[PDB]
Symmetry: D3
Subunit: 326 residues, 6 copies
Amino acid sequence: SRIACDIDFDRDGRQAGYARAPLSRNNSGWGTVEIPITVVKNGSGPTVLLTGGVHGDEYEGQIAISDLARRLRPEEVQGRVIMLPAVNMPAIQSDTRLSPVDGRDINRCFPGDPRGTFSQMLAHFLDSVILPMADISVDMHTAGHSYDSTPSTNMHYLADPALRARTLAAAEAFGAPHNVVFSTFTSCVERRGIVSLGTELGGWGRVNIEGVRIGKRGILNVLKHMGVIEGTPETAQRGGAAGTRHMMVREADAYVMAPRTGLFEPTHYVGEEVRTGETAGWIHFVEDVDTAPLELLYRRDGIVWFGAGPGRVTRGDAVAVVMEDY
Amino acid sequence: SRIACDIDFDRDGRQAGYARAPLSRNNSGWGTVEIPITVVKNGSGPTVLLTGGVHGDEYEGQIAISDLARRLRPEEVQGRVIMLPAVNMPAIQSDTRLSPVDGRDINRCFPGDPRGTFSQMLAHFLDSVILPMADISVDMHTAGHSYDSTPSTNMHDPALRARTLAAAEAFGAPHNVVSTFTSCVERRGIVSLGTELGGWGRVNIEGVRIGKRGILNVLKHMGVIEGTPETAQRGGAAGTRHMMVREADAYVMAPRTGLFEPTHYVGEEVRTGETAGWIHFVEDVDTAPLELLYRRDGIVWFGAGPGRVTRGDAVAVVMEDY
Amino acid sequence: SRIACDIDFDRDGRQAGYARAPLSRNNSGWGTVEIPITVVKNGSGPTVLLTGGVHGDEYEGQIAISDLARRLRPEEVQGRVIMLPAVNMPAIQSDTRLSPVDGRDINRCFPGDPRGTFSQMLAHFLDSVILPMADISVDMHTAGHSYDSTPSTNMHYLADPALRARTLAAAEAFGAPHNVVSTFTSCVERRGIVSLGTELGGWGRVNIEGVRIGKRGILNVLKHMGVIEGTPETAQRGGAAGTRHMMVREADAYVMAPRTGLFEPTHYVGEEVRTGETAGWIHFVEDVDTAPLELLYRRDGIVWFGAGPGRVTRGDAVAVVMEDY
Amino acid sequence: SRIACDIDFDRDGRQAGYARAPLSRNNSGWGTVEIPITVVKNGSGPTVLLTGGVHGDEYEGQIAISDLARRLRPEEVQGRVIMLPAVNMPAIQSDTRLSPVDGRDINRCFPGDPRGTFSQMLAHFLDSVILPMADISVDMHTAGHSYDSTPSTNMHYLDPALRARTLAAAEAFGAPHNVVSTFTSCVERRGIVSLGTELGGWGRVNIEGVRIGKRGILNVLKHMGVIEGTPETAQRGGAAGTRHMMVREADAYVMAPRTGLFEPTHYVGEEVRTGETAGWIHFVEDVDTAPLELLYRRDGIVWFGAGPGRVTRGDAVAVVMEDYNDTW
Amino acid sequence: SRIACDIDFDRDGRQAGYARAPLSRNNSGWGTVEIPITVVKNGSGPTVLLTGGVHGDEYEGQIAISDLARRLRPEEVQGRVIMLPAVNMPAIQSDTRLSPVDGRDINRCFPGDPRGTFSQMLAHFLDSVILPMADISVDMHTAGHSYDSTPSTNMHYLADPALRARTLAAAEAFGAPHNVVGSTFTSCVERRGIVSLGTELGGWGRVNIEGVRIGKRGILNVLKHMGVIEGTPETAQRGGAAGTRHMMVREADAYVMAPRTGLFEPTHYVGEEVRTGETAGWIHFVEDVDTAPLELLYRRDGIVWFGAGPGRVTRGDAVAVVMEDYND
Amino acid sequence: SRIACDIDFDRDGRQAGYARAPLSRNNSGWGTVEIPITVVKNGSGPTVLLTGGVHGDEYEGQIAISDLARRLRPEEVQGRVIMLPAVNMPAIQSDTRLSPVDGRDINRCFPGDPRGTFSQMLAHFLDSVILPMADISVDMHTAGHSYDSTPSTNMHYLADPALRARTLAAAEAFGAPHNVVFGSTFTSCVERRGIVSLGTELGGWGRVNIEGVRIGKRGILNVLKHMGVIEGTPETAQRGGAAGTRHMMVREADAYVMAPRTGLFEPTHYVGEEVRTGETAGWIHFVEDVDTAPLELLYRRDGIVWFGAGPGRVTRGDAVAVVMEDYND
Ligand SMILES: [Ca+2]
Ligand SMILES: [Ca+2]
Ligand SMILES: [Ca+2]
Ligand SMILES: [Ca+2]
Ligand SMILES: [Ca+2]
Ligand SMILES: [Ca+2]
């Protein structure tokens, strides 16, 4: 790896610093991008890795994790916490999913190429240098500009029933209203046999207040679950529920796709209950006089996990992803 | 105007067609952009002009007017209704506020120049050709990608000021807030209402509901279709609460570029001195976020859009009773 | 004008040089673009102005005029010929209709703004400095990337019948197969100068017959105006003795694309067509199953402009039909 | 492959649907582009793969294959016909040779990389998943925006048994001429019979090109015994079938030494002679400067003719073909 | 003007703040750009206006003015000093001459349009709101990315002979080594009959250490000259001269022009004496094997005022501009 | 390689031509870029490979090498000289460091991929086809638009002491005022193949450095003389008086003055100037702010400025100076 980092991850105490990722530009051939990293190590216990900003426009983890990284102290800690709140820095500056450097979706570039373009090199550092240190990974996402999402965690239905149990338990600990079992960074975590949670904590290009609340509590809840900091998870839900309701997305049927490009009007938001064969929304063809909207229907019973982001949708886009009980 | 339209606006009945706006592209020197226009004219009464999509990322108006354009029949009409739901077609196609043709904010180009670039040409067409026909104008906006907005009308001679408050009341939005298109309507002395029906780059379900109804109420109010404005509110209220934005203190401004986390949403009540939010500097380890305060009491009208804000952006605009 | 030119247009003989048009770039604040101008002046007679490359992607005028500018001798001339084969130099370098400098179609910028952006400044120079010297303008165009065109002259119906016949006469001398009755041409006309336009190809390519007709036409115009010796030569490839006068005047002449997609034509420019016959089809290759949309001609005539790009955009004309004048 | 396809290529009957290729955009991270596929399978026989739109600006395959796909009936078929008229959908939408997604010329991306950018992923789908099902591939091209081309098939000089089968398929196609990391490079590596076509260019739709292309793909199905009938290969000038030609030497290429405005003396399909003038590069930016004359260096027929008026140094402005010889 | 400013330019004391220029973006329809303005007013005397950053890539004014703005105290002042070190904020942030907002050279946009695009709007604010207050204007430039310049002031040959002499006097007071005599800012200052100095204090896309020194001292000198702060101008020159030398650029002959695009190698830098007929440099054609470079010659005796910037020059660029002794 | 070249590198005499690199454009699918290559072969001796314009905005190698390529004759030569003055032709045309074809920094692309994008395919041709013919390589660079640099040669520290002596000696013969000892660059390819490798830094600031052109033109002749390919002995006299090259080095993180913030950087020194640890390197001004004081930066090594600030507006994470110190073996 060409990405330089001087942090001693074996050292007791707190270190807050940067990994320095080389970046060549026309007027800065030897330029660097500074990726914030904080590590708190003390006492005895497991390593929790918290990442945010893998996509530049996904704010909730950037906020939750940098806030924690400023405040967390060695004497609060039994084990180790590694925090990278803002991984894809170039993309964070442009507030986009894709890299303004090489156009790549970094979360389609793992495990990476140490000699590749920026996103490939960064993917490689993450998977090869940072990740092997982790006992558990929480990679914090939202839908960015693509959809809204109802605050939630997510995981894969694992082969190993033991690992499957631990990830479920960690997700219950995290305590979002829902947990959804479903070349990404998470594919790397899973391939190394490390427990893997992701989150979906908003979107619509905006900051989700409830998403931030849920995500800040979530990462503390995981540190408590893992016994890295004192206490037990606070998992109470605003509509009365005492904890996380497990869900799944396994069926082509769970997706409402747009057949044509146009202006899509939805009938429901995320978190709302929906049933099969009924109206999901209409694609209006505002370009035409007289022409009637094209009705879309859900083809699943369940609840809306992702709902329509941009008003103007392109053929091939999902306008809704419906989740159902696990 | 260079923009051609064959519609006979004085003809009784229904005409649905297009204004043909010329556009030169590198592989289409003689290309045209087709702007939808629908006109219903029957009997006797005034002209209502309904415009939407002046900005391309402002949907609710394109939805409400295009749905009404499709369904309104001459029989229910006393007077005349002109309906252009999708004014700025190039920007509608790109989903942006600004034109992909000439880079302009068309809503900074009025009264417009018939010899100018695309947006200036189109601005001139709307003001010089279409607008002189109207007795009231309802111009439908939302905050698009810049903000979110709580469903509302807006506006700004006490007699004509009354007729405007009355038109707004009929519209029936929860709130009416006292070189744009609406500056042309006003200059010409025509009743002028705007709306702010949403934002966050998304389609607002209530914004659509409110706006679909608001436009029917305007026709009722003006005696063009039968009935009375249905102005009942979801919060209990009998109708529109008139509000104002005037003080420089109403705007919560961002002093620095960074990641803005709000404390409140649009529609929510706010007090002077309380925390509006923080700008986070995620580029830095160890750096604390910059806290921002409201300076006014009232309710959030416009609230933060993009997570990453630029120095000199507003992150909240507060309204208060008129 | 900010555009400098040291050419003395009243001096006998030959001057070949440039108008220097200021162009501010990020690494060249004081940069200039050189616009070729050749003037030949001798004896007594009228002034002929020949322009090409007003659109960067329209080649035949660039070729025909630059060729004549190189070859024409002051002893052959009685009067004055002013030759600008390559007007819109930045667009010529990008091979585009629109300016890579300010994005403008210069032929929507006349009479121009001397304090405007580059295309407006250049429009002003052409109308205010160059054009007033002219007794006749031939502005050489083609359809560039937009269409193909059958080799032809064009002109406006002048309400004044006297200038109308004078213009018809010049067009007949030019001797293209067909003459069809804020652009540069509108300026020529507002100044009471005889104005001919041409359409000598397109399809993003150089048209061999277009070049031939264009080179001959400008010689013919010189002869017509008495500026060089000889009488116009106007015989046509398909045997006709002279130009046939034509017109386009009805909305019906245009075959418009209702939808964006892949347009397949039935005829090329130059071909006779009849009302209600198939003009072609818009295929929707993004769709399985979906049948193409058939389009019809709405007039009888000869195709003047035919489909350019395979993929057409809603609102594009895919044919323009001309009829006998 | 990440490109999902529900089509069962073993099922008798007709399936017309899409390959769903992942395309992450800034406001559509889970977006898809739908690539039209139609398969017809019936009875007993070989598989014919027909592809068009590998380059977005080459129209004649998109028209001919999508037209056949809509109309061809499983009952008519003894074998299997897989039809993708519109392969490079993003480039098709932009009307460009190169991809607007990743800037790649997909026909420089084969065999492909399933973990690569969009064009690499698509190329891998085409070579790995689609292609191995074929006994013969016809990949339909034109010169798009780069040149015009005289209507023709093309193929590589190969193994006399494979060469004979390929030449026989070319003859059946019946274009006026057949000219002996691309897609066709994969077809050949796999030992599948591979035909290409060149059915126009000049950024436009070529009427004869569409006619010849439509007839050609029917003729191949007939040749293969896949549908009933015998190939119809008669030519407008009177010839009974295709005339074999070759492009083999550097001499066959007229090269632009300088950037300028190229005026040709000939078009595609026309006969030319060594030492005759090919055209002139004009320097319209200069007064006084004479245009640069270019010469042909081989006798033959123009196969590819100049496209854009403004040519760049290092561009070919003509490719001359000559009668085929069996001896290479 | 749509550009807002709450500063009371008639108030005694120091106000440091911003003009708020509206900038509509796709995700910020109601955005603003904040343009730094510092006013120091005290006692009695004339108003000095100091502007930098009219071009985003000309640094020396930005540095000198923002530094003075930070430090200058009302108690030191008799009159009024208005300081905008960073006028063209969007171009400053992109480090370009041209605006990334509307593509304009702001210095081709004066006197401006209050209803125009951003640069036209800003140009109109500066001319119509700020400039009428000034008794003297120093507008600080450098050659940015286009050239290097030898540190200097500049002015025009004014038709008003008394204002001409006052400007020459002002130039001498500024004390740069050299002072060199319609839509620019300075053209507006001159139309309003205000004393106008420009500067040229570097370029080459870099920060010129002597350019900063001379520029910082220059602006203090003008204040002393105008009587606004105490003291006598410091005009000692590094090579021993007592003060500024008046020079001029007046004829076409003064400009060495590139006839061709290529790689320009100069023989001299700014500040260097050159003679007529001597070699100015060579344009290399690195794209060619064998081709000799094109020799360019100076056509006037004098000193190089602007020297070549970019190595790769475009046909029509100036590659040297020679100044000669001033004559009234 | 898809890059075609007809030059017979084993043939005596002079061949001046082009390698033809395929470059697919929307209106030229079969387009090519011509990369100039001149080879002079005569008699008996080692092969010297001279490359310039690996970055399009680094001019001094393009001038020095194309000039030598035009003038050099087979009869003055004992061995073989291969000259590519203008390697990255598209970036040369755009006057940029990065490629306008694929946006790559070609010098982060070696050893390259013959099936990749343009810059990758060009990097492969240079390493696999041209580079193996060489006994020594001089790859001529400058700081382009990024920095200025004081005219100098450069080389890595080679663990191998005999190679180090051999490379040090070639640097001495080249005869720039300074030689600076300091994975996907072209030089790393030369090094991997165990060929003597020199770099240069002959200027920058977006401009043509007159002294840089002079030192580069002389240095390549000197290198040829050193290797015994042409007659004579190196000329190593320095403008400032010195008899030859002074060896220096860059080894410590403390050698780099880094910008912690984006802003307008005002330097205190140019390249070539002596500096002291703890003293002021310059200030980052925040011209977007009223009242705000600039941020002072300090040098953290005694020495001579090797690379100095380029752009006025610097970005957080850029170096604004790199200090070199006397060489210690
Ligand atoms: Ca994500
Ligand atoms: Ca709006
Ligand atoms: Ca034209
Ligand atoms: Ca092709
Ligand atoms: Ca300037
Ligand atoms: Ca370099």
